[PDB]
Amino acid sequence: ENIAPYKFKATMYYKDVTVSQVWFGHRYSQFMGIFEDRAPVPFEEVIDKINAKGVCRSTAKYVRNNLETTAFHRDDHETDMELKPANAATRTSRGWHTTDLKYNPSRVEAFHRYGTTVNCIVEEVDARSVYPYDEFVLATGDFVYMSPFYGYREGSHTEHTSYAADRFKQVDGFYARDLTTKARATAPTTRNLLTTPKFTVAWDWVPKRPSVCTMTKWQEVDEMLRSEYGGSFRFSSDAISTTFTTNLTEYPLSRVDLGDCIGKDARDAMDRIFARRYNATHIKVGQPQYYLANGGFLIAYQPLLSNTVERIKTTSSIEFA
Amino acid sequence: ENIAPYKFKATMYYKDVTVSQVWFGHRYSQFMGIFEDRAPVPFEEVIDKINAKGVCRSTAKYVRNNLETTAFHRDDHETDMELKPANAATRTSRGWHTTDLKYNPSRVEAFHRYGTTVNCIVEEVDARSVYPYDEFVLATGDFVYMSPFYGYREGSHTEHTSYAADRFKQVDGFYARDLTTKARATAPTTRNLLTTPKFTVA
Amino acid sequence: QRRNQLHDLRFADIDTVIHA
Amino acid sequence: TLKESGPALVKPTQTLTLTCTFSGFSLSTSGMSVGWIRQPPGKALEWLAHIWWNNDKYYKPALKSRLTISKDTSKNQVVLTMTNMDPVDTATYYCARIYYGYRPYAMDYWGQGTLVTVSS
Amino acid sequence: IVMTQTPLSLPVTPGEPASISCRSSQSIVHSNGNTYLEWYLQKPGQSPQLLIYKVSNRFSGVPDRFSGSGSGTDFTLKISRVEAEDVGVYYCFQGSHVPWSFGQGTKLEIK
């Protein structure tokens, strides 16, 4: 059973909008409030500005609390600002930002003053999703309530989404321009862009059926003896010292939810092993068979002869086998 | 394999600075915002004030968002306040605080009023670090991006530190004075004091 | 948390103080 | 079925608005797309624009600054707008339906097309 | 992706096979792993109709005479037995990558 999440790289475009209210006393200055908000970056700004020009506006316009709010960095006019790489941190993914210092209002004697700092931040984050893959979470602990595989093509629009359809924009034929090398990639990809209330996430879209794999290749057994006894099949491997018991009937692979991956991986590994070890002495006997073993193990088996819909739940304990 | 983190005792000195804006109506008072911050306690105030005299200033002077913030408890003149033990809780570590009530502004009619409360807090916490021990956490879930072993003596300064060298001070020969027993320990120890943007860890 | 608490270290300058 | 409709004569340097009426689909289903293509007389097919059910407009980059496709599902129509018309823009415009939502082939159902001449 | 259809005019006697080739500046292979190339046939005073989709698949309503092939950037429509009804202009259209475009088209003539 594939307990590992489906992992993929995403990019969070958002503007950190910090409004600080400062009170200036006679001999001191005190913060009377620091409103920090995260604004999504619009699609017209991710495609036209960030991806093409490598810049970002000095304003954030976003819907917060059922209001259209527009925040101007340093309270001055909107200007395009270059994205510079973030300060290096250990074990940290790449990130870029426009502004590096928090703007706070200039001193005036005995007056509360409000000062806005809009920092356009672009972070490459790891995003992960679990079955039924109707939601995925970014590395920043933010949940995104859309299937990773939501899109436009060939039934990839019936995938779950919890946002209005005006918040999603799959820019087909997307040319990624790295913000460090400033080099535009040649091979196009389908770019999904979801503008959540707090940020915008972009990820390269892939079809769901060949991208997920509800089973995971756990062991590749060169020599797995199969025997029939007591109306059941025993698959014994001396290499890993493990014996599984299955019903005599084959397991219909169509019954595995999201299961096109199992056949492909099994055939690839099986052909590789056959080429490596059994090409010169044995011959394959029929097409790969699939059996379900107690504990929830899916054994793909290729018999050899010498020339002479549901989810499978797998136990965490192999020591029974 | 040592999967268990390296565990040690750290002590967080920080001042909970709560500034609240209150609006007073005809028959009622309403909170129009409560800014809560945690300020570090300077080394001069951890060594000379907290460790020596067992008291802590009633003001926090710290750096927040690239500004020199200065908060005065109850918005009055600076005073040294005794660190008293915190209210008991089950399965919690020792903690001390100066102030016990939140200061909110006195009533005036139809005016927004701001009230500042600086509660100096000293909390003994468990701190933990995993390999390569270039950072450690506290029981409060706050990360400290600096090796537990960073110091001054014999190659203990090449350890990782993500903070400016102005934020660290290893007070060699440190005499711990318990804030409950009010007694100074006899054996000296090397004390590391890191003033993070939000608190101080020793 | 390890990544979120690095936010000011990465996309800001912790140390600088501006006074005027 | 789709039916394009627009002024048959627009003078140069003006905005031309067209309209495509549908039948058998509304542009609010999960995967429906509607595209506009022109064909100058005697020339090959030139794609212009296409809009998905979620107001996701795609244009021809050459004509992107001039083309504006909008969708009004209340009247079940798509309006194609193209400003600063030039005599080169004289062409027959076709409204098509795209099954990329459902099938791997686009532009199955075309309208009869409307011929527009750009002249004063 | 730029589609150039060759030739621009292909006169073919009825009964003989015909081949039409059109190339794309870059690969029309999509991230799906499927190539979205469609062939269209515009008859005189008629709206175009799709003939071949996904390179090697024939749309319903199209006789077995038409057959598509190719890969990468080279694609070829092929009519095994050209008939009189095949008169018209033929277009190859890439749908994989935005923006979409048609080829310059080939006019089939019956000799």
Numbering used by the authors:
A (entry chain C): 152 to 459, 492 to 504
B (entry chain B): 152 to 353
C (entry chain A): 706 to 725
D (entry chain F): 22 to 141
E (entry chain G): 21 to 131
Copy out sentences from the published article reporting this entry, exactly as the authors wrote them.
Glycoprotein B plays a crucial role in the viral entry process and is indispensable for HSV replication and pathogenesis. Similar to the humanized antibody HDIT101, which we have previously employed in clinical phase I and II trials, HDIT102 targets domain I of the fusion protein gB of HSV-1 and HSV-2. Domain I is part of the outermost exposure on the gB surface in the prefusion conformation and contributes to the structural rearrangements that gB undergoes during the fusion process, making it an attractive target for antibody therapy. To determine the exact epitopes of HDIT101 and HDIT102 in gB, we solved the cryo-EM co-structures of Fab bound to HSV-1F or HSV-2G recombinant gB ectodomain in post-fusion conformation at resolutions of 3.12Å to 3.45Å.
We have developed the humanized monoclonal antibody HDIT101, whose ancestor is the murine monoclonal antibody 2c, which has been generated through hybridoma technology from mice hyperimmunized with HSV-1, binding to glycoprotein B (gB) of HSV-1 and HSV-2, a key component of the cell-entry machinery of HSV. HDIT101 heavy and light chain CDR residues were in close proximity with HSV-1F/HSV-2G gB residues Y303/Y295, R304/R296, E305/E297, H308/H300 and D323/D315, while HDIT102 CDR residues were near HSV-1F/HSV-2G gB residues D199/D191, K204/K196, R304/R296, K320/K312, Y326/Y318 and R335/R327. Using HEK293T cells ectopically expressing HSV-1F gB increasing concentrations of either HDIT101 IgG or HDIT102 IgG but not an irrelevant control IgG were able to reduce the binding signal of the murine MAb2c containing identical CDRs to HDIT101. These results indicate that steric hindrance prevents HDIT101 and HDIT102 from simultaneous binding to their epitopes. Interestingly, structural analyses showed that both Fabs bound in a perpendicular way, suggesting that inter-gB-trimer crosslinking by HDIT101 and HDIT102 IgG may result in differently oriented Fc domains and that heterogenic immune complexes may be formed by mixed binding of HDIT101 and HDIT102 to individual protomers within a trimer. Specific HSV-1F gB amino acid residues in close proximity to HDIT101 or HDIT102 CDR residues in the cryo-EM co-structure were interrogated for their contribution to IgG-mediated inhibition of gB-induced cell–cell fusion by substitution to alanine. After five rounds of replication, presence of suboptimal concentrations of HDIT101 generated resistance mutant HSV-1F R304Q and HSV-2G R296Q, respectively, while propagation of the viruses under increasing doses of HDIT102 generated resistance escape mutants HSV-1F R335Q and HSV-2G R327W, respectively. We next analyzed 451 HSV-1 and 368 HSV-2 full-length gB DNA sequences retrieved by nucleotide BLAST (NCBI) and found that HSV-1/2 R304/R296, Y303/Y295, E305/E297, H308/H300 and D323/D315 were conserved to 100%, suggesting that the HDIT101 targeted gB region is not under natural selection pressure neither in HSV-1 nor in HSV-2.
